[PDB]
Amino acid sequence: RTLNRYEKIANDIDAIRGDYENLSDDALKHKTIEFKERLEKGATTDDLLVEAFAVVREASRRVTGMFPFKVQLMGGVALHDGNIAEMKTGEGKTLTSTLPVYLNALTGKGVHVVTVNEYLASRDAEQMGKIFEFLGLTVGLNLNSMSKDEKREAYAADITYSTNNELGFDYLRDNMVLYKEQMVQRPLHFAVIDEVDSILIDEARTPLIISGQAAKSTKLYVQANAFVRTLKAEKDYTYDIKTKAVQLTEEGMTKAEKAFGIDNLFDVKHVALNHHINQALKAHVAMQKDVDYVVEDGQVVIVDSFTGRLMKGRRYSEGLHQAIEAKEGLEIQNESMTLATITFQNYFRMYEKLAGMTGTAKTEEEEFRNIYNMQVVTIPTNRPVVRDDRPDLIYRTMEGKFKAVAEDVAQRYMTGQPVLVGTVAVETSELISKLLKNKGIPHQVLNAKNHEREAQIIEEAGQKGAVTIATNMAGRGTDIKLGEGVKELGGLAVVGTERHESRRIDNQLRGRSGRQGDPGITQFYLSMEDELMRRFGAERTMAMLDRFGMDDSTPIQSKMVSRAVESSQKRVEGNNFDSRKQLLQYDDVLRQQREVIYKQRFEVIDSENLREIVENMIKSSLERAIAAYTPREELPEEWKLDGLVDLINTTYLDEGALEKSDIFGKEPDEMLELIMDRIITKYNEKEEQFGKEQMREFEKVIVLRAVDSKWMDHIDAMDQLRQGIHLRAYAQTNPLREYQMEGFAMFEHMIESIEDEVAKFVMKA
Amino acid sequence: QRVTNFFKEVVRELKKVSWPNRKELVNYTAVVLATVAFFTVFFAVIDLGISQLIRLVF
Amino acid sequence: FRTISNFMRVSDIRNKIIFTLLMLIVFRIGTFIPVPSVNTDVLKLQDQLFCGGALQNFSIFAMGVMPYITASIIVQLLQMDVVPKFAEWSKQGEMGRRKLAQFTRYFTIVLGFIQALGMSYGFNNLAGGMLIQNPGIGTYLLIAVVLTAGTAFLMWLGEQITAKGVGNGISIIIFAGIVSGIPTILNQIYAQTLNIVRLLLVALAVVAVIVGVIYIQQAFRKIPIQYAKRLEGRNPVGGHSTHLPLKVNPAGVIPVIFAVSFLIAPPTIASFFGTNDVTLWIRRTFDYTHPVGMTIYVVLIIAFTYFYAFVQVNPEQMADNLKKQGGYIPGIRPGKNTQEYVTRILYRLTLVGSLFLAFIAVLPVFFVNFANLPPSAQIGGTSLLIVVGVALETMKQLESQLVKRHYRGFIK
Amino acid sequence: KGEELFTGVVPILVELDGDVNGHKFSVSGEGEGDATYGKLTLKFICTTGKLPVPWPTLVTTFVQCFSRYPDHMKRHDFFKSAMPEGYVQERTISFKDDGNYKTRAEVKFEGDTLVNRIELKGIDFKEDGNILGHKLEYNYNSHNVYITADKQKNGIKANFKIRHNIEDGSVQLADHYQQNTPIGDGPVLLPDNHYLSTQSALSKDPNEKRDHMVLLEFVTAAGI
Amino acid sequence: AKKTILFLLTVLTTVLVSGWVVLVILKTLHMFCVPFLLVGAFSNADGDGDSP
Amino acid sequence: VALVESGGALVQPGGSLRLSCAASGFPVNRYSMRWYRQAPGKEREWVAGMSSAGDRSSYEDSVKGRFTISRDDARNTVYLQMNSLKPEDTAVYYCNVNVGFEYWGQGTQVTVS
Ligand SMILES: Nc1ncnc2c1ncn2[C@@H]1O[C@H](COP(=O)(O)OP(=O)(O)O)[C@@H](O)[C@H]1O
Ligand code: BEF
Ligand SMILES: [Mg+2]
């Protein structure tokens, strides 16, 4: 058991704490310099473990006054070995993050501290920058809206606080470079993650896409918006609520065909009109207005489901965002075009050493074992949990639940106890706020739209009689400090209103009230017609719901409804598990291709003279054309060399260089050798005329432009195949093997096209 | 005679079947004959081996 | 051939094929160590007075893996429109597949138990009095427990081959049983010796029928599907469009088992009835080797393969599942008309597959009558179909791992 | 809007009749035009016989609305203001060392399609020069059309010089003075000086029989 | 009434199980064990995009 | 198909020097190559150029009888000449060929003082 090893390590930490206290200032920075010089002599990271943890403990005492406990040293040494150190919520994990990032950044490689959203990153950045700048290291906060040079200066530091979106987009924009100095990242060394459950389990489903703007079309969107606006709802389109999708009925198809004047909707000529109709219908029905986006300055900003914030850069795909812009008469803008694609699993698997603290990862320990090769070290609490959590109060129809939670927060407001009202969607928080407008209770709503006052709202949410309605921004890492006189009456009565997508998220929301052994109250509230229950509930118990009457003055008391709630939540977790596993084992193939392509692109960026590279590509495409004509299985002396010599004189060589009598039925290897000799002489002429450098820049531009274009076409075709392979699993074969074989064939076609294009662009210019 | 058009449609649909070509069919035939010959030779060898073993241990 | 030499260069696939051969050796040495009460010397004498596993040694797993296949086909028939519980288990996700697999495991345990009791009594009948020493009802527990232990060990072995071996482990096990029954009939063919022209004629016949089976079994029918939600608004290559395949023989070797079950059930109830002129008339007339039951066999093949084609593809649920996510056959409505379209295509495809499967099922009696052949040959039966199917799918899986290993890059 | 409506591909009919020195010519043709990429792919056929004046002296007479515009010059176009209402253009084309074309064309969306109806009258000619001697190479160069506006006529006056590769090894510098008129009178857009950077390509079809000109052409604008 | 024929075929498979209750013989045992059928590998059954 | 040119230097009006322009990517043998010049403040004008594989050669009237454009097929380039030049011909000189598109040289600046 490694816990005893961590415990005796912590005892050693306390032993060296016993004599490090009497050290004066300015020797701590001298101790950092001493560690830096002693490291490269013969020492490793594990040799300098105890003294570094003791000196950073002493530095924390001298700077911030928060002396780390015994368990935080155990978490730090667990984070050094590369294992997930699951600590319970509110146990002070931030200094536990400061320990091994001070240990591992003495090499000078660079250590990335990753978390979920922006404000949490900035708060941890300023506090641990105040800690680390006393030691003598450089801490650079990475943002979303920085410049290229600001990002370059940030990753040049020792410790880079950043979110996961910015790190992913910086790696992905790090492989669309036309130079080398415009690169922003260092080599990848280390990544201490916070909230590993969310990043590597919850939002590991959605991959990262970068897109540039393509050509713009307009007429189909507004025509489809008018047609969908005249559609009479339930009779003409179905709307399944088990999964968010809509399709036209037969009468809707007849109305669609008689509206646009076409004869058949599902003809192959009218694929664009049908696609626009379907996307406009999905934008008009499935996407509610304030549950999944907002309206800002004529633009549409989508609201992330996982972190709860709004991300100003990321539109939707497949023309869905244009239909949302056409829903409210806004200025429709350009269309997207995929440039690069990476998931979070492969990107964090490139990091070569990583670890991460969390709050609730004990449920997913086998998934952390199978994928990232890590195990979950449970860690004690140093003080017993007094966070009392009552069981759920399941209600009938939703306005009864809102009345009950309004009565609860009213009876708790007149006692001085602060209450954080959790929510999930955005507009329902405003519904609770305007339901609290009557009875006169002051409050600060924390929406996705009111996000700029977040720091003062959060620090003001721990005083006497504070009421805070907050959506998922307050979910993951919001630290609410208990103010004055509040611990007497058991402060921070956290009241949720919706069962979340998984047990970890609402368990974190429950754990928001604990805060180092302080008394808190955690009550939930559910509805029988709630979105989760109506979206994933079992159909057998739906008839039993009407058996309990309808007055909604009291919650239901039954074990059947609790069993149905837990079964529905576990079904949602099972669906997310299946989607995660399927997306990972489908993206493994694209990982294997993408690593090779980025490796060759980075190889041809920093070459002093890549004459041999274009020589090898030209001769490979040349001999492939040589074998494309003149086949082994026909005969000699009927190979039709006129077409081949025309192809050589137009594509590879100049016009007046060759005829049929130059070869006229020779061996193919010697004839491609002769063509290679003439190409070598011509390229020597081009090199001696352009000089050494301008020719190099010219073919570098040619290679990079062609490689980017064909890689974009390949990733688009790969996604188009990825839908069809899930369809293709109908004959009794597993689809993943067929996907791998077809992906390899398309990769070969792409690399043959890349060699042909670079040959015919170098040799004719 | 309601079956003339039916069997004409059967033949017409059989002309839309993507049959494998000659080279891959010959390759598949060679593969399946090779593996059945390898498996029958290997099993004859291992059966005579365990027969010799059970003879020598009596 | 360089393709077999490429496999040994790769460490991991040579590790898994050597592990597969080791587990094959483990299976093959198991059928020579029997239950502690056989009197198998008398059993070898009684055959003198190819299901040759139990014939040589009524072993620890003489029943083998057949209960796993019959329990899987029972629960696969039970998933369709006969109980809502298994329908909800099928449509509740992969967690439902997990408990469905565990229910299948328990079903294999109980079905192997009851069929082990049945096969023990039936082989005791053809022995006559003495097959087990002091044969009563209390002695059936030991043989039932060791036969179910052999079945559970074989299923664990198949799980290990699916985990770290080459391919579908139970398929490999059935293939091993067939090719282990091969060399004994090869020895019988050698010991039978007109001399040469019969041998070359049946070699040509075997090569022709295996070429025909490969030519039928790999054939696809590509229904094109265009997805609505995909833009397809860039420059395409167009070489590999999205399409829906239909196998020409969509059922496999299910309906021959259904046909032989419905065919040998009336002799079973006639043996249970006793002795009568109608009993002997049924036994004479419900034999598929006699040409008066052959027509019954062929029409049963055709009807059961139509049934299993329409229960395997399930065109109503296929049409609803295809309508539920986007796309459609071009020019066809996504409601009832796509179901009618795929029903007509399935009608014609299962007709030609029906005639193919009936010819393959009727082949071995024609060979044994027109070849002067020993009766235990059974060449060209369902064994040919399963051998070529598992050989082709294992070769495809290994070549998929090989082309995963191969990647070029344009630096070279 | 108007031609912002026609971002997709546009059918292009060209009809030309004309007279030079009492000698008749009549050439027609059809093709496609694109605005978001801004190109013209046009198959043109001489449907009267033989060319009095050659095809390179024809190509500036052969539909200037199919430019490609980047994001900033979207305000600064005239040729999306008179369309779909219709367009009229006449040119004085002075050949140095030879006579003068007066070309007479209306370029308008007839029904849907872009029809260029051209009548060309070429006067002041001597036949023993270069153009009626057919001294032109089968090619056309790259150019810059200078565009300005006038408000007494509220139309567009275009100035440019063009350069024909003569088969003796010389060039015919010929200057175009171009007058550009709306037909409808809606929102007119009269921008400042700018220039169409244009390039062309003349080729043929190997599986076509008669004397036909195949035109492929790129237009871009810049300046404003 | 196809549920009835599904139940009939499943109890016929149990009859094939119970067919070893028998009271040429090589042909009969080849009708019992020899075919050795294959499992069909039946059901291999089986969110939006984003931007920068 | 990118023209590279050289041979430009500070020259007296009593000396004769050759102006070279290398053709790269296409043969000199079957295309008409022309020489242009453009002074600072002057518009780019045609000076000289020969067609039909160098048996007939035309020049502008400012250097007619003075300049001579020559070429070599083995060297795949052309040669101009600055014989009997004047300070009025101070310009940046260009070579121009038309193979499908029209490609210009980068420009060789010659100043006379
Ligand atoms: N050793 C300590 N002494 C005093 N207070 C501490 C100590 N460690 C942590 N805390 C307090 O506990 C809070 C925990 O905050 P944080 O670490 O952000 O939450 P989490 O533990 O969920 O990551 C901090 O705000 C800090 O003020
Ligand atoms: F996990 Be903590 F309360 F930042
Ligand atoms: Mg935290």
PDB file of C-alpha atoms in Angstrom, chain B:
ATOM      1  CA  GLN B   1     -47.548 -15.651 -65.836  1.00  0.00           C
ATOM      2  CA  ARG B   2     -46.758 -13.319 -62.932  1.00  0.00           C
ATOM      3  CA  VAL B   3     -43.259 -14.783 -62.497  1.00  0.00           C
ATOM      4  CA  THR B   4     -41.587 -13.765 -65.776  1.00  0.00           C
ATOM      5  CA  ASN B   5     -41.283 -10.125 -64.692  1.00  0.00           C
ATOM      6  CA  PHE B   6     -40.362 -11.315 -61.183  1.00  0.00           C
ATOM      7  CA  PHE B   7     -37.442 -13.431 -62.379  1.00  0.00           C
ATOM      8  CA  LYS B   8     -36.427 -10.673 -64.809  1.00  0.00           C
ATOM      9  CA  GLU B   9     -36.236  -8.351 -61.800  1.00  0.00           C
ATOM     10  CA  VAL B  10     -34.234 -11.039 -59.968  1.00  0.00           C
ATOM     11  CA  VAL B  11     -31.677 -11.194 -62.796  1.00  0.00           C
ATOM     12  CA  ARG B  12     -31.669  -7.386 -63.069  1.00  0.00           C
ATOM     13  CA  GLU B  13     -30.946  -7.075 -59.353  1.00  0.00           C
ATOM     14  CA  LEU B  14     -28.245  -9.732 -59.654  1.00  0.00           C
ATOM     15  CA  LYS B  15     -26.581  -7.520 -62.258  1.00  0.00           C
ATOM     16  CA  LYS B  16     -26.291  -4.803 -59.577  1.00  0.00           C
ATOM     17  CA  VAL B  17     -24.443  -7.075 -57.132  1.00  0.00           C
ATOM     18  CA  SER B  18     -20.831  -6.029 -56.529  1.00  0.00           C
ATOM     19  CA  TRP B  19     -19.173  -9.387 -57.065  1.00  0.00           C
ATOM     20  CA  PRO B  20     -15.447  -9.624 -56.298  1.00  0.00           C
ATOM     21  CA  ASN B  21     -13.128  -9.720 -59.296  1.00  0.00           C
ATOM     22  CA  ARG B  22     -10.801 -12.508 -60.415  1.00  0.00           C
ATOM     23  CA  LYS B  23      -7.572 -11.535 -58.638  1.00  0.00           C
ATOM     24  CA  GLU B  24      -9.020 -11.142 -55.141  1.00  0.00           C
ATOM     25  CA  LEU B  25     -11.053 -14.337 -55.592  1.00  0.00           C
ATOM     26  CA  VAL B  26      -7.908 -16.295 -56.502  1.00  0.00           C
ATOM     27  CA  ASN B  27      -6.095 -14.680 -53.556  1.00  0.00           C
ATOM     28  CA  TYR B  28      -8.922 -15.646 -51.174  1.00  0.00           C
ATOM     29  CA  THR B  29      -8.977 -19.214 -52.518  1.00  0.00           C
ATOM     30  CA  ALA B  30      -5.216 -19.507 -52.011  1.00  0.00           C
ATOM     31  CA  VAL B  31      -5.528 -18.097 -48.477  1.00  0.00           C
ATOM     32  CA  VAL B  32      -8.299 -20.462 -47.397  1.00  0.00           C
ATOM     33  CA  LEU B  33      -6.613 -23.522 -48.949  1.00  0.00           C
ATOM     34  CA  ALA B  34      -3.314 -22.561 -47.303  1.00  0.00           C
ATOM     35  CA  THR B  35      -4.851 -22.180 -43.858  1.00  0.00           C
ATOM     36  CA  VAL B  36      -6.898 -25.387 -44.064  1.00  0.00           C
ATOM     37  CA  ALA B  37      -3.793 -27.320 -45.187  1.00  0.00           C
ATOM     38  CA  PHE B  38      -1.664 -25.741 -42.446  1.00  0.00           C
ATOM     39  CA  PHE B  39      -4.275 -26.493 -39.785  1.00  0.00           C
ATOM     40  CA  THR B  40      -4.785 -30.105 -40.871  1.00  0.00           C
ATOM     41  CA  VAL B  41      -1.019 -30.774 -40.998  1.00  0.00           C
ATOM     42  CA  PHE B  42      -0.504 -29.108 -37.606  1.00  0.00           C
ATOM     43  CA  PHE B  43      -3.351 -31.066 -36.036  1.00  0.00           C
ATOM     44  CA  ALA B  44      -2.136 -34.388 -37.465  1.00  0.00           C
ATOM     45  CA  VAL B  45       1.328 -33.639 -36.049  1.00  0.00           C
ATOM     46  CA  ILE B  46       0.029 -32.697 -32.608  1.00  0.00           C
ATOM     47  CA  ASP B  47      -2.339 -35.696 -32.468  1.00  0.00           C
ATOM     48  CA  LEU B  48       0.479 -38.105 -33.300  1.00  0.00           C
ATOM     49  CA  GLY B  49       2.618 -36.310 -30.710  1.00  0.00           C
ATOM     50  CA  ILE B  50       0.077 -36.703 -27.919  1.00  0.00           C
ATOM     51  CA  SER B  51      -0.464 -40.314 -29.033  1.00  0.00           C
ATOM     52  CA  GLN B  52       3.278 -40.954 -28.639  1.00  0.00           C
ATOM     53  CA  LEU B  53       3.197 -39.207 -25.249  1.00  0.00           C
ATOM     54  CA  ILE B  54       0.255 -41.260 -23.979  1.00  0.00           C
ATOM     55  CA  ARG B  55       1.945 -44.407 -25.301  1.00  0.00           C
ATOM     56  CA  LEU B  56       5.221 -43.656 -23.514  1.00  0.00           C
ATOM     57  CA  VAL B  57       3.546 -42.752 -20.199  1.00  0.00           C
ATOM     58  CA  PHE B  58       1.451 -45.989 -20.455  1.00  0.00           C
TER      59      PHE B  58
END
